[PDB]
Amino acid sequence: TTCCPSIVARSNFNVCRLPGTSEAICATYTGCIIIPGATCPGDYAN
């Protein structure tokens, strides 16, 4: 599951994914995170 810190970061993440970039690279690129669960925390609400 991916969780993002802000709207901007999520929008950025989704563009990063368009060419097929791994989620892990898009995460460090944007400040989004990958978690094994499905429940994003309050400070990664977007």
Terminal CA-CA length for the chain: 12
Structure tokens at 6: 């802000």
| Residue 26 host element (H or E) | helix 23-30
Question: CA–CA separation, 18 vs 3, rounded Å?
Answer: 17
Structure tokens at 11: 């929008």
Residue 44 is given by DSSP the state G
Reported resolution, Å: 0.9
| CATH classification code of 1-46 | 3.30.1350.10
